[PDB]
Design a protein around this nucleic acid. Sequence first.
RNA 1: ACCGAAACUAAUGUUAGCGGACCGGAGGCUAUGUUGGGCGUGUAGUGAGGCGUAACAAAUAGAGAAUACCCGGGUGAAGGAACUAGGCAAAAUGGUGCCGUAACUUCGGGAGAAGGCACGCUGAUAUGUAGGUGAGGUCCCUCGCGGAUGGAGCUGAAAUCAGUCGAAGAUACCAGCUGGCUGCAAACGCGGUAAGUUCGUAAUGAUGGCCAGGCUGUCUCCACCGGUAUGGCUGUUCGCCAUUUAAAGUCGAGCUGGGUCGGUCCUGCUCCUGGACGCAUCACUGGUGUUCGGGUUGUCAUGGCACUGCCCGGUAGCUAAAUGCGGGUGUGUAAGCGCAGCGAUGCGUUGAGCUAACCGG
Lengths: 363, 114, 123
Amino acid sequence: MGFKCGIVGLPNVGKSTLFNALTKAGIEAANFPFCTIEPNTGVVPMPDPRLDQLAEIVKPQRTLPTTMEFVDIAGLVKGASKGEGLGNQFLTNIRETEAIGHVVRCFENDNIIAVSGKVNPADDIEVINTELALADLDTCERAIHRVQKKAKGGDKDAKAELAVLEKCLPQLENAGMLRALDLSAEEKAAIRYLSFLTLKPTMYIANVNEDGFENNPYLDQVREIAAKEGSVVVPVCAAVEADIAELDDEERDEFMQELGLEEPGLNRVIRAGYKLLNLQTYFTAGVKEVRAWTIPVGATAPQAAGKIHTDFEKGFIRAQTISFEDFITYKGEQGAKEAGKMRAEGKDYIVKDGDVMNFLFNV
Amino acid sequence: SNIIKQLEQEQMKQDVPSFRPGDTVEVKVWVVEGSKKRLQAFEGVVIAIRNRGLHSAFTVRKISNGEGVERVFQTHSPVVDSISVKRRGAVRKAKLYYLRERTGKAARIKERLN
Amino acid sequence: MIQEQTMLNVADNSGARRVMCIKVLGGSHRRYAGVGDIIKITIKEAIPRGKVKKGDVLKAVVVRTKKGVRRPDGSVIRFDGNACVLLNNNSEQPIGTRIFGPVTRELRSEKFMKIISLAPEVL
RNA sequence: ACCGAAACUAAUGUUAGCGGACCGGAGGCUAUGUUGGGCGUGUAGUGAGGCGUAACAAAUAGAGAAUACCCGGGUGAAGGAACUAGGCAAAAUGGUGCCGUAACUUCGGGAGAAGGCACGCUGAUAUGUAGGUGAGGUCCCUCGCGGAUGGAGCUGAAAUCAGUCGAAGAUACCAGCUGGCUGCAAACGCGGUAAGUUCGUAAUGAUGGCCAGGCUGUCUCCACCGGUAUGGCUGUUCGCCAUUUAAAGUCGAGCUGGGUCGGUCCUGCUCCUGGACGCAUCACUGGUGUUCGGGUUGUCAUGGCACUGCCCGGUAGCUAAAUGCGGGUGUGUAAGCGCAGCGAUGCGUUGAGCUAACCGG
Ligand SMILES: [Mg+2]
Ligand SMILES: [Mg+2]
Ligand SMILES: [Mg+2]
Ligand SMILES: [Mg+2]
Ligand SMILES: [Mg+2]
Ligand SMILES: [Mg+2]
Ligand SMILES: [Mg+2]
Ligand SMILES: [Mg+2]
Ligand SMILES: [Mg+2]
Ligand SMILES: [Mg+2]
Ligand SMILES: [Mg+2]
Ligand SMILES: [Mg+2]
Ligand SMILES: [Mg+2]
Ligand SMILES: [Mg+2]
Ligand SMILES: [Mg+2]
Ligand SMILES: [Mg+2]
Ligand SMILES: [Mg+2]
Ligand SMILES: [Mg+2]
Ligand SMILES: [Mg+2]
Ligand SMILES: [Mg+2]
Ligand SMILES: [Mg+2]
Ligand SMILES: [Mg+2]
Ligand SMILES: [Mg+2]
Ligand SMILES: [Mg+2]
Ligand SMILES: [Mg+2]
Ligand SMILES: [Mg+2]
Ligand SMILES: [Mg+2]
Ligand SMILES: [Mg+2]
Ligand SMILES: [Mg+2]
Ligand SMILES: [Mg+2]
């Protein structure tokens, strides 16, 4: 399974070019095992300085970078959340994902014409959020119908579930977001399985002109809303990302130096989606390959190893986990052994980001 | 007094719609920021109406962002731009203060279908 | 209308869950604090891994009161509970990074424009 | 042993609580109630009663002989013990059923621990069920105040499902506050707070101390019917401490009674508008509003009574927390009639009826 952030948004905002250039960033699956490309399943790789910095010392034969997964949520009409077939399909396509990336056109363009005719991030954002809010209203009303009769039966767990649902309901009736509520961790636990749509974190993908990265009223409104909802933003230019997709390495370097961009905004979307879900990556060092491995934050060494192979979990005994600072500054594994910066990590320690590790199992 | 009646009458709004306790209403009020002036919408259940001519007021209760908010509008003040009844509720009290104890399911008000 | 010993819920993500007003700042014998007033608070309940600890003493700005605020036209806005936003004891800036629930325009002073910008809804 | 009818606290000068345990408790039988329409004999068990000379229930509702009906209280915005020696007093809890119940333990307890859910009415199951009672008739009979059968009639829970009304169904009265630590005494065995002057032993205690949840007019601060801190500790003055501030400068024929374990009395702040105090007012926001309207429990005859029975609202007035310096109002669709429904009830008439102190005549 992949940690997935569905790309949603209104039509004629520049999302099409955006995920086209995102797919163009994807690697050909002819060399990566188990990688199957559905036309809308966008599996994109990690431009990672850490892994090549490791490879500068470990010097592996190949490199296996980790990748994330994206869903293009295409096809949208107003009023879709009343249970229409296309509305159900849109809602289901969002449901199976883990986070939401909402795209907002933030650049003036008379050749890109919208249904409103007026460029306004606020009302477009409000429209799509109201759609998802009505969907979650339907889901939530079904939920209280299911749970109130159980809680009347004395079930304390269903009681707490009922309290959380009753606090959620007026937000959805008010077409409001569940992320705007002060919900504690156990309330999140209680209503995690209902998979509330507005509850998942969102990243505001603001499509803007090349020269409009600043001094932009549309960016101003997007930033304001993202601050209010505690969501993050990422400013991108469809033309710039499309060119980066259309250019090979040296001409891409030339173009990024032309525009004064230290690193492209597609990398920013990658990092936003990656860090939004509270997940990290560690590194395994080898002569065959140094591989970056993606786990949720807090997953143990046995659990991360089982994510590799179940024998590495069940038989796990100990791991030699090295912090990346002590790994780099002492120039590789042998320098680490000479400095003694290793960790004989057992099963209970929580994996930290980027730690160079070696896994020992017994099956 | 006739004097105060005349003074108040020449100030009263003419287009105040009919609404009753239990009605969900949306009250469009004026918010003045810097110099610009815009409409802000407060939609909620009318839980109380005070009828005193120019001094008529009504209380609207909503659950905004998981927090109960009651706003008491002065019916004839210019700050209240408009009132629109979005739903007619069927209650029997004149003052629905008991909704201050209600949450979600118990807070539904039957629709006055007539 | 908050006084000493009044227990307020917390309207930000700073980790405090309930705080108690131990002082109404800004005047000798000052009885009460309404919306927009700085109070001195102790923290009675906090989430275990929050930015603030149980028993810390710091400041807060009252943002919602049951007693409510009056508007120049005679309107009153009342909330179901008293809520405050925790403030750094010295800089008097918010300690949390998000604000929960509505606030009122009486906060719209240069002192608290951060809270206004982060608030879900300003009444 | 437990809860609860028939001298621990406070106020007043008995009342409300408390410990042990307009009044109208001032198997068979029977009294008696509800509903319907002495002698003789010698019975259940010497011996009630019955019989001779209608049934049922059984020694209004309720378990009941409780209870209700036949300065002293009420309410209170926001806060919620900041009061104080001390939560004193008040507020609160409060029933039944089911679920659930920790440490510890002398294995009984703790325990009603704590905590959670349901509760009205109507209909159906079932034209009144399970159960109780038990006529006639039938049969038997050592033949009677007998036995068996039989179920008429009477009484009758409790439960489920469905419906339905209110804000609220243990609706009134009645009716545990709960939890944590600890001293002492029963037999028995051998850190907390922002701030804190405060030999064991289960159970028990109107016992001493401390803490917490709830609750609250105890208090901020009471309302209605020139300036010159607040708190924790302590009896403290003081003092330290927490946090403020411009600053915290150097009286018991008024109250209390802690001391002497228990024990009679004006200016801040911001930029280049606030705090505190005082006066006035009620237009606004509200409180009160036992004189207005409504809901509802029990009972008695729409009304009385039950704290205004309990409540929900609320006019005027008063008021602070508020702000200056015929109609109207309130309540919320009366009654009656009609319709739907088996019925509770809903709907129409109908925003009806009623409407105090208000306004205009
Ligand atoms: Mg006894
Ligand atoms: Mg005595
Ligand atoms: Mg005396
Ligand atoms: Mg007595
Ligand atoms: Mg006893
Ligand atoms: Mg007793
Ligand atoms: Mg008799
Ligand atoms: Mg009596
Ligand atoms: Mg009282
Ligand atoms: Mg009060
Ligand atoms: Mg109150
Ligand atoms: Mg409280
Ligand atoms: Mg004290
Ligand atoms: Mg004191
Ligand atoms: Mg007492
Ligand atoms: Mg009492
Ligand atoms: Mg001692
Ligand atoms: Mg004793
Ligand atoms: Mg204390
Ligand atoms: Mg100490
Ligand atoms: Mg005083
Ligand atoms: Mg004394
Ligand atoms: Mg005296
Ligand atoms: Mg008046
Ligand atoms: Mg009032
Ligand atoms: Mg009253
Ligand atoms: Mg009488
Ligand atoms: Mg009376
Ligand atoms: Mg009487
Ligand atoms: Mg009537």
